Design a protein around this nucleic acid. Sequence first.
RNA 1: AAGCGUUUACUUUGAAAAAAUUAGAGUGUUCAAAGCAGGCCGCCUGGAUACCGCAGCUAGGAAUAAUGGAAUAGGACCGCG
RNA 2: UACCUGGUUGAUCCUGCCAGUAGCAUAUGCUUGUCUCAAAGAUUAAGCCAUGCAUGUCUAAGUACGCACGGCCGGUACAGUGAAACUGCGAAUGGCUCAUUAAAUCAGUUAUGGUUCCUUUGGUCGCUCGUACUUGGAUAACUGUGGUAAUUCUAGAGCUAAUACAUGCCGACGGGCGCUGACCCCCUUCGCGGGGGGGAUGCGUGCAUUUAUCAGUGGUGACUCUAGAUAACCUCGGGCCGAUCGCACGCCCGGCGGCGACGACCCAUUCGAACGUCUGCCCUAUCAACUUUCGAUGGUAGUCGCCGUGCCUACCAUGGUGACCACGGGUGACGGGGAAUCAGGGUUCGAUUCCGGAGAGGGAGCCUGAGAAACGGCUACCACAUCCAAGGAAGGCAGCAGGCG
Lengths: 206, 143, 262, 177
Amino acid sequence: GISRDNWHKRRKTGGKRKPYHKKRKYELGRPAANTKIGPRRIHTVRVRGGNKKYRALRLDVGNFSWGSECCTRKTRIIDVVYNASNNELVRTKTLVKNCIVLIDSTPYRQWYESHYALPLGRKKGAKLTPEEEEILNKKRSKKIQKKYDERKKNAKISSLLEEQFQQGKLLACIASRPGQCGRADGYVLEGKELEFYLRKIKARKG
Amino acid sequence: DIQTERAYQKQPTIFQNKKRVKLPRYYKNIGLGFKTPKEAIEGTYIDKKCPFTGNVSIRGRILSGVVTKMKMQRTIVIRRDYLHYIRKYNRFEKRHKNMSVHLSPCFRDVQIGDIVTVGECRPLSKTVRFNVLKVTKAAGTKK
Amino acid sequence: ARGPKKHLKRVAAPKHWMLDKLTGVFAPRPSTGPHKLRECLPLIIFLRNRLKYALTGDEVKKICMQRFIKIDGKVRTDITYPAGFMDVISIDKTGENFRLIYDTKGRFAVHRITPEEAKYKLCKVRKIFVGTKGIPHLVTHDARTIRYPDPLIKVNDTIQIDLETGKITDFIKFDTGNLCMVTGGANLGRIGVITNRERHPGSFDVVHVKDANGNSFATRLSNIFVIGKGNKPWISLPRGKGIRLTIAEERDKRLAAKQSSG
Amino acid sequence: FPMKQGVLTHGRVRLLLSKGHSCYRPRRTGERKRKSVRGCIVDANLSVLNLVIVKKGEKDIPGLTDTTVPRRLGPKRASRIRKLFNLSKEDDVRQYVVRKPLNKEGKKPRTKAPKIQRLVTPRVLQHKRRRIALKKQRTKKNKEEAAEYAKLLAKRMKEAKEKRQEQIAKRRRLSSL
RNA sequence: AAGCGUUUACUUUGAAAAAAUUAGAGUGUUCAAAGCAGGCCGCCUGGAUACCGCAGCUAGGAAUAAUGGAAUAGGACCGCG
RNA sequence: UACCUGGUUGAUCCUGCCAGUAGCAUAUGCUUGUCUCAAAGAUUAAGCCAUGCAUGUCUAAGUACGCACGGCCGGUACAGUGAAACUGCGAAUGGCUCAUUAAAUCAGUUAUGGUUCCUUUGGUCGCUCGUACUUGGAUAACUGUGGUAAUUCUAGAGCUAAUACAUGCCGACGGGCGCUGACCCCCUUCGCGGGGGGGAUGCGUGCAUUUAUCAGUGGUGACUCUAGAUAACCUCGGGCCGAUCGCACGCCCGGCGGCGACGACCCAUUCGAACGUCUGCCCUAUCAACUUUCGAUGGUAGUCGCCGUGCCUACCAUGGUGACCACGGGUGACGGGGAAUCAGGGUUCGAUUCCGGAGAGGGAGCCUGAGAAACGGCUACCACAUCCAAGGAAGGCAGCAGGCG
């Protein structure tokens, strides 16, 4: 197959390296995974040393971390928006490392409304009819209200992050290598990182 | 200033999106009695191949050279004069091997003819296996 | 080659085994174990060439399969087990215990020890590891990973382990003035007191060791094994006592003993 | 040339066959070899067809259904013996194992019984007690060695605190000097 | 006792440098080419040593051959606002 | 032993080469009594091969219902050998040759802090909080039918075993640690307020992998090292937490026990393998410019890989080497330790028993396996070549002998 070798190409000066041996097994090269968004299809590949790597081929879930409060949730990926490597990786929705994806914000909304007891998202005009989040937001005791108020004092959220929670989709960068270990984890963008990636998405869209 | 590439430029060690009520910069010692430069700590750039603010460690050999080419970006070409002794003809000869060394951007006052100190590391590219550790100015020419 | 080696040539065999050329093409390749390739002496060579008990390798296989040779706490049934430095071979029927110490030359010595000495042995630690639950681990030269140690132990120290339980009893810390056994190189078999330590950042350190007769010599740290504190070793020493006197003095000691014996 | 299921032809097809495939026994561990088989469609370009009578008709054939051949080997696993004889988990298997008579000229008539595999025996019970006793020994060794290292670390902490107090007393002596 | 010290070429010591082969201690394979053996009423033993180009590490020297200080003075040094 | 002699001329002295002189290799001619060692299809053809052999293997310790032998003490399975076979491991070791290869291999010195690693050895393996006195069905060996001219070609029918293939809990297991926390208690304030404790239900809480944060037990010259805590995953083409076996036999009043063997998740050790740092190689200018959007030299971000790298991909900059000989070509060049000649200097050979590299006529691709781009492994093309009943099958002696050229 394809070989990883520094001898198949030219020198520093420009001459040609004549082959003194053929392709080896330690010069192993395998084709790309190029995973998609769908039901979980992860194959196993025996590698050098008897170990196993995990090729994703279609994958939707991803355990994504939010770093200002350091909590991860298993979140389904729905869209691929930005990739600094190739424009074709944005055209055809292919997950690789350092992709900017739109992820569901409802587990982070549930965690925020269960921890800090503050409304998150919730465009004015709608109320929850199963009443479960209303029960989770109301019905507080005497001395635990001080702890909820001390949580409320340190619950400032950014403007662009608040707009993204209002839209319901967050921007997440894929940090784990998806085609090697099979997992496609990552972290939610915040601050100047999110401003830079939104400026690049706006420059792409025009 | 910085961040002119397509992706975001940051250091993989430090975190910068903490709860706010200057960004923290990571640096490290290099060993072998070499002192760290001031601008590598004071600056706001990044470099993943810098021997002070990057994921690379200086091992093996520590050598020297003289700078002869600076036409490349984030790397320079040094020149190495050495004398070879043939056992038959008891004289010397001038040979030079001009290796490519990754010039870290912590040094800015670098011209040609400057004696530079290089150090062995992991191969960062096809022909670069060396980082610039310290830069000595050439003989004379204060301006 | 397309994998790991399994044979070893007689010419490619190391010098300290002192094997002969006329007999065989191959040499007994030592198996994988606590010691390296060119630092040990196998059980088949120790039983056939040094002691001259058996005659053939089949007889060596018969001796090791009658369960007679008990190497350092457990009977091994292999003829090419790596028996390196500080190894106690216990033979039950003869009542003889052998400690593998180097001679003053490059070879090992047939060194007879008491069972009171054979109960313990001394081993230099190589490194200190931190296990998965914050547990310190000592890794020695014979790959003995011993955990929960005395926290006084450093990288270049020696520990006195017990063969019947596999636990440490005492230790020698690397201090200036202690004894030394040079375990490798041109000074293979030298015994002297440590008089200088020279550190090197990046480069490899060196130790100047002074002989008891006044012969100071430098030695790299990779071939240094301390055997006691000051001038009191905790092992028994073979004849020669690690001096390496001159070849004219060796000729004199041979000729005077020959003319005295007659 | 033999047949093959699923290749779905009528002529002659050469295919790669490995371990786990029909009409090819591997010789090396993982050896693959081109073999020549036929499709699973029955035509006149054949020699022998293998037929299995599933349902027996009205009349009785004297060639197949007349002479009945008994089974050659009996069950060997005790669970299969229980499944055959409809046994419980408390009754005996050794008295209910199937044994075979042996008779020929010259030698005496014998009766041979198979070795029952996976039968509950006190040797397996002793091994089952043995590995959990080794687990108990490992846990007791970890507890005793952790307690001994806790005592040793407490002694080292006491002497290190004494050394720190000596160093702070030396600093106080230098400050008074 | 630990650290620093204007850079090289040079020069001296020290470790690392696989064996066989090269020289060479001992040995009556009847001598010798060879081999690592043998002698005594269980022991004595040896199976050494030397060379190992070239490059690299370390520890002293600065004669020799380069290299530059400060000259529109943004020149050193002990101190201040 | 730092060595000369004859030859141009009628004769002399030079330069100058030739011829003598002595070894080490290769062949050849003549002759040949003993004995100890001893090279031996390398030079042209790394050209082609009939024949036969060269890697298979069982211990009391994985499977034993072939009477092939076999003991009588049996009805409480298997006395003990044991063909064949499943499974495990080796077959990636060794032998041959130098075809290719000129900063390539290789020699000296380095690091893997940038990676893997069978076996052996030393550590781990009630740490996890939810039928176990032992789980399920398929098959070989065997009985029987055979197809083909022929193969180490195999199929349908009846079975039967696992340390081959999957599922999988009892015991520790009663309480600890973080959370939600119903609710309760004490003091003070007229009161809101403030301070200090106990606690129902449920969840998570072993090692290993992935994501990010906080702090900084033990070291290195140096970590984004080892380790602690924090919020989850733990790839159905699933990760370990023994659903194994053998020998004498004991202690309680059914429960407890030894010597071992084998297989295993992780950390070390060893044999290594591979990528890298610096220096070193024959001749040629009738080879002066070479490389480069068919990667050339770097940066950013990815893919693959065991890991670091244009190894490869998308976009940017036009760079990189060279008269100190790059680039191109040739070699009757594998490199080295070494061999011969020798005053000192050097000159020539090295394919050859020791190490490293390459390979089985030429390339290319892959399963197995820890380790192969393996060829006494396969898969396609070129060249050679075997049996045929004319449908097909089958091969790689630069291994050992042997045959042709």
